[PDB]
Amino acid sequence: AFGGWLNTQGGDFTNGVTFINEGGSHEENPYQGIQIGVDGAPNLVEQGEVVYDDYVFSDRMEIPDDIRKEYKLRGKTFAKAAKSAQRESEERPNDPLSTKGLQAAMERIATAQEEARQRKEAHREG
Amino acid sequence: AFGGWLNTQGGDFTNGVTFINEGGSHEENPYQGIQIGVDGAPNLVEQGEVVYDDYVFSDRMEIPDDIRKEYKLRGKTFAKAAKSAQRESEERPNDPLSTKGLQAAMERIATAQEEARQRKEAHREG
Amino acid sequence: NFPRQMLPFSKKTKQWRKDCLLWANQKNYSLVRKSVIHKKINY
Amino acid sequence: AGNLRVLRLYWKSKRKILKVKSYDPETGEEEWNFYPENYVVNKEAGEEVQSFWVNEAWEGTMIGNEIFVNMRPRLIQYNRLNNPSRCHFGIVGSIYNLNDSRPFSLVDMMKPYNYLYDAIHDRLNKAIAS
Amino acid sequence: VFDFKVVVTNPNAISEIEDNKKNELLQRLQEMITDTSISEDEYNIKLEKLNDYYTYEWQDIREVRANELLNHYIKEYDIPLIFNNGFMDAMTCGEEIYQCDIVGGEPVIERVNPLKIRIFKSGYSNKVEDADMIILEDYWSPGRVIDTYYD
Amino acid sequence: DYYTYEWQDIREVRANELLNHYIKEYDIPLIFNNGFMDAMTCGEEIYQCDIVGGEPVIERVNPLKIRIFKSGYSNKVEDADMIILEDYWSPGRVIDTYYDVLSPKDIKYIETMPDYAGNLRVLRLYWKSKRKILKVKSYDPETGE
Amino acid sequence: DLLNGRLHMSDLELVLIKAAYIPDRLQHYPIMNSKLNVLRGEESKR
Amino acid sequence: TLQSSHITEWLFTIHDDVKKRALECFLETAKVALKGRNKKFQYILSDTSTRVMEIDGDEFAEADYGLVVDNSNGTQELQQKLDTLAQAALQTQTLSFSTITKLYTSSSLAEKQRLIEKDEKQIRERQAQAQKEQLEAQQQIAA
Amino acid sequence: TLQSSHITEWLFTIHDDVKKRALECFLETAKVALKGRNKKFQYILSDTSTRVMEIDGDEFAEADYGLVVDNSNGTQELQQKLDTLAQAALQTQTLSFSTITKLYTSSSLAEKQRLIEKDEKQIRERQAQAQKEQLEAQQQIAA
Ligand SMILES: [Mg+2]
Ligand SMILES: [Mg+2]
C-alpha cells in the first residue's frame, strides 16, 4: 500500500507510522471516518492524518511560525510534518538509529501539537 | 454435474457453491421443492437458485440499479450474480485466495439481497 | 509463439489454452542437463 | 503398438491479485490480505489496494492429436504460507552435477574404460581365433 | 534403513493460534459426537475416545495425520522400489525425477523417465521444482487414459 | 515455569528453535557438502543469507558468479565493501522474489522478451554506502551520569 | 571442468585441437574424483 | 570398506535429499486429495485426522506449520530413546501392555510421547487417590 | 588412518568455521524476518519466543548478547552429561517421564537444564510438605 510501509522481499515491514489514507473526511465518510480501533470506543480518523504510538497527528491544523522555528518543523500541517520527519525511517525500518530518531522526532511533533492546541484553546476561551 | 463442482482427476472438488438445478419451480414440483435438507424442516429450493453456506440466493428476484451500482453486481438476478461471482473459484477450489474472494463476494451479494428484501417488504407494507 | 500469459482470468479461454498446448506440441535445450542422445547411449 | 501419444504440459501462468491493507475493527492493527483481481476493495473503511501479478501453475493434456483434456490451473497448487507466488508442479527431482554444470555421472566416468576394455578384448578374441 | 517420518521440528513450541485451532477442532468433534450418539447410549463412549485428545496439540494432530498418510501409501505402493529405480537412473544419467499426482482420486507417485521430460526455463537451478515449464511426452495405453480421464 | 527462566535462556531457545526448524527444512547439511566440494575445487566457500517470500533462505554462491571488490587481503568474505552477483534466473524465480515491487511495465518487459534459454540476467549489487549520524551526549536527569 | 571430465589442451601446452578425436586430442582419466569424494563423504557423516 | 563407502556417500546423500523432497510433495498431494470426496481416507485416517482439513490453512505446505519429513540420526535416536523409555516404563508397573502395543504400532513419535504421558498421569493420580483413601479410612477408624 | 585424517583436518576445521559463521548469518536473517508480519513464525516458535522481538534489543547480533552458534567438544560433552544426568534422575523417582520426553525433544541445553531444575524443586517441595503433613497428623493424634 506504500503508506508508511516497506513491502519488499515478500515481507511487510513498518516503521511504526500509520498512514491512514483512502478513508475520507469525517463529514464525507458515512461512518464518520475509518474507525481504526476500539478503546473512547469510536476512534475515528480521516484521510490526511497519521498515527504513531497511538498518537494522532492532525492534518486540518496548521503550524504557527512561532512553533515552526522552535522544534524545527518542515510541513505546513502537523500531519505533513510527521510525513517529513519519518521519510528516512521508511526505507530502513530496522535500523536502531532510525527508530531512535523517529521516536525523538515524533515526541517533538507531539509536544508541538499539544502546545498549539493549548494556545488555540486558550485563545478561543479568551 | 458441472454446477459448482470440478470433477477432474478422479475426484469431486467443490468451491462451496451448490448449483441447485434439474428440479423445477416450486409450483411445478409435486413436493414443492427439492428438499435439500431438514433443519425449518422443509428446506425447499428450485432449479434457478444457488446456495453458499446455508444461505439462499433468490433467482426470481431482480437487482435494482441502485444495488447494481454499489456492491458492483453483474447478473440481472441475484442467482446469476453469484453464478458470475464464483466463476473464478470454480476452476480452482483449493486456492486460498479464491476461497477468500468467494467468501467476500458471497457476503456482499448476501447483504445486497437482504437490502433488496427489506426494501421490498417495506414498500409492500407501505 | 507462446500466447500471452499476462491476462485476466476471463480472457484465458478455451482457445487460449488450446494455443498453449499447440505450442507445446510444436516444441529441447537445457543448461544443466545432457542431451537425450547421451543419456540414451548410457542406458 | 496400439498406444496413444499422451502429451502433458505444465507451465507457470501469471495471475493478477490484490494486496489489501485493512484495519482490525477492534484494535488499531492494520492487516494484510491477498485477494484475486475480481475482489472489490471496500472503500469507506480505509482499505488500500495494490495490484500484483503472481505466478500460477497451469496444466493441460493432449491425447493423440484431437483430444484436449484438463486445461485449467493445477488443482494441486503447492502453496506457501506467506508467498502466493511460490508454486510448482508435482514433478520433483535433482541433477547430480557440480557447480552449475551438467552431470558427470558415474557411467560417464566409467565408460572410456569400458570402451577400452571392449577394444582390448576384441584383440584377445581375434588372437584366440587365429 | 528407510524410516521417513514426519516430525515436529520444535515439539515444545506452542502458540496461541495453535491452541485456537485445537479448540476449534475439539468443538467440531464435540458437535459431531453429539449428533451421532443416540441419547446417552454411546455419548460417553465418544467422550472417552476424545478425552485423550485434550492432551494433544495442533502440531501433534497434523503430524499424526501426515504420518498415517505417508505410512499407508509407502506400505501400499512399495515406494522404496521406486526410489531404487530412480537411484539407478541417477547413477546412469545424474538425473533423478519423480512426479506426484492425483489419479482416480488417490495420490500416486511415479518415476519420470529422464528421456521423456523436457525441462524449460530454469536458472542453472539444480532442483527440478524451480523450472517454470515441463512437458511429459509418453505413449500411454488406452486403458490408462480412460482410467485417468474418464470423468 | 517461565519464572525460572532467564533472558539469555529465552533468547537461546528462540534461536535454537529457528535454526533447528530451518536446518531440518532446507537440508543445510547438503548445502554445506556442496560448498565443501566447491572449496576443495577452488579454495573458496561462500554462502548468501537473504529473505525471499518473507522467510529466511540460505544459498550456496557459485565462485564463478560473485565479484568481490575492495577487500583488505582478508580471507573472509564479510570484510568486502562491494559485491556483484551476476546470474541467470528464470522468469518464475524473479516473479517469486519481486512480485511485491515489480511494476506492470516490468512484467510486460518480462512478457515481451523474444524468448528465443528464456532466462533473465539478474545482476544484484551490494555496496557499503556511508551515512551521516550524530553522536549526542546527554545527562541522565535523575543522576549526574 | 577437470572435475567434470573436460581437458583443455591449452592448459598443459601451446596448441600449434578443436576436433573431438584422440589422434590430435588427449584423453582425460578422472583419477582425482575419488580423492575429493572421500573427503566430501566424510564431511557428510561428521 | 568404510573409506570406500565415503566415495559414494555423496551420491547417497543427494539421493536421500531427493527422497525427502519427493515424500513432501506426495504428502501435499495427499492433503489436496483429502478434500475430494474420497472415502478411502475415512479408513486409513482417524476422526481428528479427517477434521484437520476442516480448519483453515490446510492449503499450505506442511513446512510452514513446523512439520518436515525427516530421515536423520536425530529422529532415529529419538525413536530408540522413546522405545527404551517405554520398555523401562513397563517395568516398575508404570505403563500398561495395551499402550505398549499402541507404541509398537504408532508410526508417530508425538503419539507415543502423549501415550506415555497419559499413562504416567493416570497411574500417578490412581496412586494419589489410593493413598488418600487409605489415610481417610485410618482416620475414620480412629474417630 | 588417523594420521592421514590429520592431513585434511585443516580443510575440515576451516569448513566448520565457515559453517558456524554461515549459521550465525542465517540466525540474524531469521531475526530480521521475524518482524515482517509472517505467520509461519507463529507455528515454529513459542509465545515467549515470539514476544522477545517486542523488546528494544532485537536489532543487534546475538553474539553481543552472549549467544553463539557452536559445535565443539564442550557442547557435545555438556549434552551427554545432561542426558546421562537426566537418565540417572529418572531412576530414584526424581524426574518424570513427561519431562524426560521434553528433554528428548528440546534442542536447547538451557531448556532441559531448566526442566531438570523445575522437577527437582517440585519434587522436593512435595516431599517436604508430605513430611510436614505426616508430622502434624501424628501430633494432632497425640493431642
Ligand atoms: Mg483405519
Ligand atoms: Mg509449533
Tab-separated table of C-alpha atoms in Angstrom, chain E residues 38-111:
chain	number	residue	atom	x	y	z
E	38	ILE	CA	-28.262	-41.556	20.236
E	39	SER	CA	-29.350	-40.158	23.606
E	40	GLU	CA	-26.638	-41.232	26.073
E	41	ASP	CA	-26.296	-44.775	24.636
E	42	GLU	CA	-22.757	-44.179	23.316
E	43	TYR	CA	-22.229	-40.468	24.073
E	44	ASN	CA	-19.951	-41.359	26.990
E	45	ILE	CA	-18.042	-43.695	24.669
E	46	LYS	CA	-17.294	-40.734	22.400
E	47	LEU	CA	-16.239	-38.600	25.376
E	48	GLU	CA	-13.915	-41.405	26.468
E	49	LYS	CA	-12.475	-41.594	22.953
E	50	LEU	CA	-11.860	-37.836	22.648
E	51	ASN	CA	-10.724	-37.128	26.223
E	52	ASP	CA	-7.206	-38.337	25.395
E	53	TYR	CA	-7.042	-35.696	22.630
E	54	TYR	CA	-7.165	-32.823	25.135
E	55	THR	CA	-3.503	-33.532	25.927
E	56	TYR	CA	-2.700	-33.399	22.196
E	57	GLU	CA	-1.647	-30.256	20.326
E	58	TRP	CA	-2.492	-28.910	16.882
E	59	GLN	CA	1.011	-29.757	15.678
E	60	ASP	CA	0.665	-33.274	17.095
E	61	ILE	CA	-2.615	-33.891	15.256
E	62	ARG	CA	-1.182	-32.579	11.980
E	63	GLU	CA	1.956	-34.697	12.384
E	64	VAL	CA	-0.218	-37.718	13.140
E	65	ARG	CA	-2.314	-37.218	10.002
E	66	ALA	CA	0.792	-36.791	7.858
E	67	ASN	CA	2.398	-39.910	9.342
E	68	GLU	CA	-0.651	-42.103	8.719
E	69	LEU	CA	-0.920	-40.873	5.122
E	70	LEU	CA	2.770	-41.423	4.388
E	71	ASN	CA	2.934	-44.772	6.194
E	72	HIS	CA	-0.126	-46.180	4.446
E	73	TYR	CA	0.944	-45.118	0.977
E	74	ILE	CA	4.572	-46.173	1.482
E	75	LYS	CA	3.421	-49.629	2.569
E	76	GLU	CA	0.907	-49.739	-0.295
E	77	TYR	CA	2.887	-48.566	-3.324
E	78	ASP	CA	6.234	-50.039	-2.184
E	79	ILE	CA	7.802	-46.622	-2.666
E	80	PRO	CA	11.352	-47.848	-1.817
E	81	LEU	CA	11.394	-49.831	-5.072
E	82	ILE	CA	10.501	-46.635	-6.943
E	83	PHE	CA	13.357	-44.875	-5.164
E	84	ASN	CA	15.735	-47.715	-6.061
E	85	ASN	CA	14.836	-47.429	-9.748
E	86	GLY	CA	15.278	-43.666	-9.572
E	87	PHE	CA	18.648	-44.172	-7.893
E	88	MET	CA	19.804	-46.419	-10.727
E	89	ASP	CA	18.646	-43.809	-13.241
E	90	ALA	CA	20.547	-41.164	-11.267
E	91	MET	CA	23.689	-43.288	-11.475
E	92	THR	CA	23.216	-43.673	-15.227
E	93	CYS	CA	22.374	-40.029	-16.047
E	94	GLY	CA	22.903	-37.974	-12.907
E	95	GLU	CA	19.195	-37.074	-13.020
E	96	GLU	CA	16.562	-38.341	-10.570
E	97	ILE	CA	12.991	-37.154	-11.206
E	98	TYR	CA	9.673	-38.169	-9.631
E	99	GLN	CA	6.127	-36.977	-10.328
E	100	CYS	CA	3.378	-36.899	-7.698
E	101	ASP	CA	-0.221	-36.535	-8.837
E	102	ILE	CA	-3.842	-37.452	-8.123
E	103	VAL	CA	-5.208	-40.317	-10.232
E	104	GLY	CA	-8.616	-41.814	-9.569
E	105	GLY	CA	-8.953	-39.519	-6.562
E	106	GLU	CA	-5.971	-41.136	-4.764
E	107	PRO	CA	-2.463	-39.620	-4.634
E	108	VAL	CA	0.135	-41.502	-6.666
E	109	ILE	CA	3.890	-41.107	-7.137
E	110	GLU	CA	5.679	-42.119	-10.340
E	111	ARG	CA	9.251	-42.105	-11.609
